[PDB]
Design a protein around this ligand. Structure first.
Ligand SMILES: *[C@@H]1O[C@H](CO)[C@@H](O)[C@H](O)[C@H]1NC(C)=O
Ligand SMILES: *[C@@H]1O[C@H](CO)[C@@H](O)[C@H](O)[C@H]1NC(C)=O
Ligand SMILES: *[C@@H]1O[C@H](CO)[C@@H](O)[C@H](O)[C@H]1NC(C)=O
Ligand SMILES: *[C@@H]1O[C@H](CO)[C@@H](O)[C@H](O)[C@H]1NC(C)=O
Ligand SMILES: *[C@@H]1O[C@H](CO)[C@@H](O)[C@H](O)[C@H]1NC(C)=O
Ligand SMILES: *[C@@H]1O[C@H](CO)[C@@H](O)[C@H](O)[C@H]1NC(C)=O
Ligand SMILES: *[C@@H]1O[C@H](CO)[C@@H](O)[C@H](O)[C@H]1NC(C)=O
Ligand SMILES: *[C@@H]1O[C@H](CO)[C@@H](O)[C@H](O)[C@H]1NC(C)=O
Ligand SMILES: *[C@@H]1O[C@H](CO)[C@@H](O)[C@H](O)[C@H]1NC(C)=O
Lengths: 314, 163, 314, 163, 314, 163
């Protein structure tokens, strides 16, 4: 009576502590390479921003009119998105983006600002709606007449809610100093925002810029986060885009950047720009910048784990 | 998998088994408990390695608008370091698990061989290539008694001792 | 003669490479969970800042009068601490905090600044001592009379010591431009600090801020680190809080933030906000932000290490 | 811990030991050198794992006044990555150490069994369940000679060979 | 017939999972400690900057006249290097350094800027060549006469190449406001750079600084990176060092800081300030800040790997 | 390396070997295949551990002009964390590899001993200290037949069984 073990004619070579290419009976893969070229969003509140930029949802350009008070568990940024309609830029833009990606949506509230002795209906041809408009959440403050002066103003806002408020204002930079005198008058303009954690400090810089959307003027967007019962104060005398509504974070979510379509048929927690990684393997060799609940990225494209015995054929 | 000079490619019923050749006929039957033991151990390894992490990592870069070059170089530096750590851990993990798997199967085979050896006290003698020489023609019922561990170690003793 | 091994009626289940719940004879814990709700400071020079803020020890508000030249191996920050008495803020505050946490204390030295043609005894009601005072290490420079002008001034300081010096000055921001003309006169004010590694650049921004301690004025605190034999220079014409004494790092220490009491009866090198982690285990599941010489934080609350054999009872 | 079908819950004096039953009486004595060997090995594992690090890590966050949101997200990202690495290392470390511990104890038991087997050359025969059948009534003095490895392998040979 | 194993009279103690000091037959080292005190540059295009600073290669001080269009696979910075001849400093200097370290060299191209109504041959005694010169890649723009005014100017540059362009300009800070009126005239000066990813914002700050090279004036160097077909625009009215030639990254390289000599006889991919680490071992205990393709740094100075069996002598 | 109470310091020709002492003379010859097996395994370990990384890490600090203190503290914090991870991985790697190396050599020795034991079925008996007692004077040609695994297990049986 002879006893032994099984064997196969064609095994699978694996690597061990000792050798390289040990032919075993059975083996399975541990490094995931299969990628689903879609954003698997089955069972999640998804907001595809599309042509709307993530920061725009706070200021409200025409492309973000349907994203002013969104709510989602998964936020998708697109490459065609734009934060601005009038050529501008955000200060500390990426930090605000990372804040809004995990915000779970935003909730707007009227700040309750009223004015006396100044105009307020500033508009432009780039922020187009019915005709010439502006940012839906902002107000372009100017001087009452086509020139004149700007009275030194001080407007205050107190956060009466239990969550931190997102306050965003804008400094204007016209094509020249003459246009600045046309909009707000001559003299040195100064904008001051102060609170409990904040302390600035804002002065305009007119000049000629490259024409974006046929416009050489720029708008600097700034933002601070008021704490509950904390009060913020603005002291401005021109070149000031006033905030009309403040934002409040709804809850929690995740933000990704992708260029593939949305699919509610598959479910996944690991996302990258090329799709969703659906796998139970502990490692993956698809994208080192994948976010969510992912297998850990490794440089090896394959690491075969032995599931059978040593294969010794006749 | 050492002195057993090979494997039985024809053994498609299990991992380990016997192949008896007496005067009545031939036989090749797989051992279910040892095969199920090794299969259970490898299955446990797969259950431990195939794992889902509940740790969510958020986006720290920006593929559409590159962040500050300095903080971007720090982010890329950290990500590359962590990638080296996890590549090392994956390589060493797979290699070690494969080593312990092969040694585990070999250990199961050896322990089975020693089991049958201890079942045949003096009625059989080791051949040296993984077989047992029986000094008395053991019929198929005796073979089945050897497989299910019911062969009597004394009611066949004197006959084999004379031979 | 039969030989075997021992066994127990109630073992301890552990986890291995193969199974989950293997009952062994004996096992010990590897993940620490017991926390001492105190700051174990036995054998260390400890300074509990209390109501004094860490940065205040450089400027010297009334609550930091007893911390101007402290010396410690362990620095504890409290939640009730305050860096300022007059409402203000530090630029690059967290970097300066991290510098002061491992400084081992500070050593003040008179910078030797004398003035001609200006006042110097500026004070306020918030920085209260006997009556109305100011920062002990700073001097509030004003114009001689209740209005007038501010002469363009240039004061220089050379670090004659072998260690880098901490230089901290302050720009003033009054409630309005009229108060700025009252304190320092009309015209654009400009503050310039220059050295070998530094090059700024400072202009004031008056305006109305929310009343902190009944005051709407703010003070920006800035700081640079002079190298040995390196010279720093200030060119100012108003809105300038001049430094009176420079700081020098004593040696080495550690800085923690906590809210529990100090205990000189227990010794520990691992601290967190909830107390001290005293353990010999390689891992801990108490606080991922623990500092000092700590076991590495892990997410598992328990990982039982087998210290005995396999338990196979009858 | 395989073919020994169990453990002796009554063996409170050591880890491994004997339990003889001849014509004079009963016996259960623990083996000190093997038990002390396994205890020494496990003790070494504890001395290696229970370790104190001389690396001091300073405070990089701020629990009372939150730092910049960007650098705070980078700090949290790095800390979470390192936490994943150390959780993995801790899990795998504990699992591997437990595996090698169990296999170590089993190895010590087997090597002891083979020791006593080599002490009894032809005067005894393996039973198959971890016991040794002696073909001559070995008294308690002979048992004590077997325990301390002084039993003569030839001065009891012929008597057992006849049986 | 007795069979056994070999042994030696003097073995090597190693560490295992169980014991500490197990004497085995043979053992090899795994932690590298041998260091080559040279920069092994065999087979690589190497540029030793020497007295030229890395950033200077963009602006072109006299010490960088032979590094304006260098090309290398390995860039070495020296401690005696200097980025400036006239006392100045770079804004975001370390990011630009890290950009230039992996640039593979730089390629200059004339930006094509012409002027009308202003002087352009500003020079100094510190940037010495034949006599008194200036930065080779920059132009010191002044007013035509010894005082007068500066006309508000707007110069634009479009990147016509497929790679991002490095644009570097400079703001001047004279010893006083009187010297600023001498060079560029009275009034508030303002410099504006704008593009697609950029939006500033520049105003000068005259004042007295410590004399570096006998000069109390400073020059702030700023830089942006134009994308292909993207246009940058400058609107300046004084205190402006104009760029004459833009830079383009050649390819790829590595940047190190060292103080040892260059050796083309040895080859190595792991560099630190003390030399080159040439080793096949997986770990090293030489320098934790080593760059290139290095063994991973560990704190242990030695970790002996067992290559032989257990040594049990008689 | 357990019951073989020592090693032969005079065995300079290989790792494992024999040392026979019959009536014709003395003998000490190294076994090439087992020694080459263990040497091949250790060599494989060295080929796996001695490795060159193709991952290039760029300079993130500045030794001549210190960077921002905050980002410098984050960089030092991350670098120290990674250094702790790699020191742990190096220590555990070396310790585990040494353990498996020692156990590997011991395993090879034991399997060789069992090989020669299976070559001598009933013509020899285990002594207990790693030697085999032969009950018939095996000459040097018989010793050479034992070394190269050609000794006949039956053409010397009856003579030793009588003894
Ligand atoms: C071989 O391994 C794979 C791993 O995916 C498994 O699905 C399959 O059942 C295994 N086959 C056998 C015969 O065990
Ligand atoms: C906020 O202020 C309101 C009214 O002043 C008060 O009732 C409430 O308790 C405050 N809450 C906090 C958290 O300060
Ligand atoms: C970091 O790596 C990504 C690719 O993974 C690259 O696009 C990016 O430019 C790198 N960061 C910097 C600052 O170059
Ligand atoms: C069981 O393990 C613990 C670990 O803390 C140890 O203190 C104890 O002495 C052990 N008991 C025995 C009987 O080994
Ligand atoms: C600093 O300056 C003093 C006097 O000028 C000189 O004696 C000393 O050597 C200098 N030390 C350094 C480090 O420059
Ligand atoms: C990082 O995590 C801590 C809790 O561990 C949290 O308080 C903090 O807000 C986080 N950082 C940011 C930028 O949200
Ligand atoms: C001992 O180990 C070293 C490792 O460098 C090796 O070079 C040498 O050949 C080894 N000696 C023997 C006899 O194996
Ligand atoms: C850049 O512009 C030129 C001319 O306007 C055009 O031919 C070319 O395709 C453009 N390339 C890109 C990448 O925009
Ligand atoms: C980081 O460590 C280096 C030495 O490795 C030291 O020179 C440097 O000062 C440290 N960083 C900070 C911000 O102190």
């Amino acid at each position: 009576i002879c006893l032994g073990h099984h064997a196969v004619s064609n095994g699978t070579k694996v690597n061990t502590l000792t050798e390289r290419g040990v032919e075993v009976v059975n083996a399975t893969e541990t490094v995931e390479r299969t990628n689903i070229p879609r954003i698997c969003s089955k069972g999640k509140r998804t907001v595809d921003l599309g042509q709307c930029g993530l920061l725009g949802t706070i200021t409200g350009p025409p492309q973000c009119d349907q994203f002013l008070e969104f709510s989602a568990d998964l936020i998708i940024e697109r490459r065609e998105g734009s934060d601005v309609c009038y050529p501008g830029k955000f200060v500390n833009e990426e930090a605000l983006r990372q804040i809004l990606r995990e915000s779970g949506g935003i909730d707007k509230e009227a700040m309750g600002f009223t004015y006396s002795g100044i105009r307020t209906n500033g508009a432009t041809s780039s922020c187009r709606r019915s005709g010439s408009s502006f940012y839906a959440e902002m107000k372009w403050l100017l001087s009452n007449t086509d020139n004149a002066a700007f009275p030194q103003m001080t407007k205050s806002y107190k956060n009466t809610r239990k969550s931190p408020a997102l306050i965003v204002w804008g400094i204007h930079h016209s094509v020249s100093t003459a246009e600045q005198t046309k909009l707000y008058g001559s003299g040195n303009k100064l904008v001051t925002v102060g609170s409990s954690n904040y302390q600035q400090s804002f002065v305009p810089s007119p000049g000629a810029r490259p024409q974006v959307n046929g416009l050489s003027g720029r708008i600097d967007f700034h933002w601070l986060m008021l704490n509950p019962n904390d009060t913020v104060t603005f002291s401005f005398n021109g070149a000031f885009i006033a905030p009309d509504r403040a934002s409040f974070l709804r809850g929690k979510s995740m933000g990704i950047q992708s260029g593939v379509q949305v699919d509610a048929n598959c479910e996944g927690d690991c996302y990258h720009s090329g799709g969703t990684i659906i796998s139970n393997l502990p490692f993956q060799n698809i994208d080192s910048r994948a976010v969510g609940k992912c297998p850990r990225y490794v440089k090896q494209r394959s690491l075969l784990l032995a599931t059978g015995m040593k294969n010794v054929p006749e | 998998a050492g002195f057993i000079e090979n494997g039985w490619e024809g053994l498609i019923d299990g991992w380990y088994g016997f192949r008896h050749q007496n005067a009545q006929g031939e036989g090749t039957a797989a051992d279910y408990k040892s095969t199920q033991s090794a299969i259970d151990q490898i299955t446990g390894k797969l259950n431990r390695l195939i794992e889902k992490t509940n740790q969510q990592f958020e986006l720290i870069d920006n593929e559409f608008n590159e962040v500050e070059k300095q903080i971007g170089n720090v982010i890329n530096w950290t990500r590359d370091s962590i990638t080296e750590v996890w590549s090392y851990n994956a390589e060493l993990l797979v290699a070690m698990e494969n080593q312990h798997t092969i040694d585990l199967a070999d250990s199961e085979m050896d322990k089975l061989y020693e089991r049958v050896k201890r079942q045949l006290r003096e009625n059989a003698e080791e051949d040296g290539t993984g077989c047992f020489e029986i000094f008395h023609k053991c019929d198929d019922d005796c073979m089945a008694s050897i497989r299910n561990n019911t062969y009597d170690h004394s009611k066949y003793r004197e006959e084999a001792m004379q031979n």
